[PDB]
Symmetry: none
Subunit: 113 residues, 2 copies
Amino acid sequence: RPWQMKDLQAIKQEVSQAAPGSPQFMQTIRLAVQQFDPTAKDLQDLLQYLCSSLVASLHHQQLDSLISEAETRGITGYNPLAGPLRVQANNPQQQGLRREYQQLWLAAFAALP
Amino acid sequence: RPWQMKDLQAIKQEVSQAAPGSPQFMQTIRLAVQQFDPTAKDLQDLLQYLCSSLVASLHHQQLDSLISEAETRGITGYNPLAGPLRVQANNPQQQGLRREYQQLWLAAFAALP
């Protein structure tokens, strides 16, 4: 049950005025992420739709650092012999990795301003 | 029939002008809750969506007070040998607990000011 075009259009329109990482944007994006239960691929699509290449790159770097610390510590469900967290989160049998990816994503995007 | 994006986006759209505790806010919240019959999970999602973190924290303080009072006094179908009302309202076969939690939710929201 992935999102459709209308959901993305509403998500972008409702937060057109606000700035990335504002409380309003964080509310709406967090609700979307917690409601649709998407993988990393869909999150990348959503970010490309919402913010430009500059904000995309900044979030990419911040999320790289956050994932770096998180999975360098060691995580309950992460096994580094199978692939990067971006790929484990895309397997529907690793929901723990998917939820960790979602939370790192939202925190990274909130850490912009 | 848990609410999708469109329902919650509307709810926030018409709960934007008014402030918590005002007649309009409570009217809309009560209608939504009485219609969709949401558990504690969906209620917490809706609250995080609507108002700032400060208002959510205030509401949860009031809700903890109400729930503690009710559990001391006694609930019709509350059996504490399995988990708190908080967790007993997530089981779909406990309609009484769910409706009681919804009513305490609405009361705690109405008593913020």
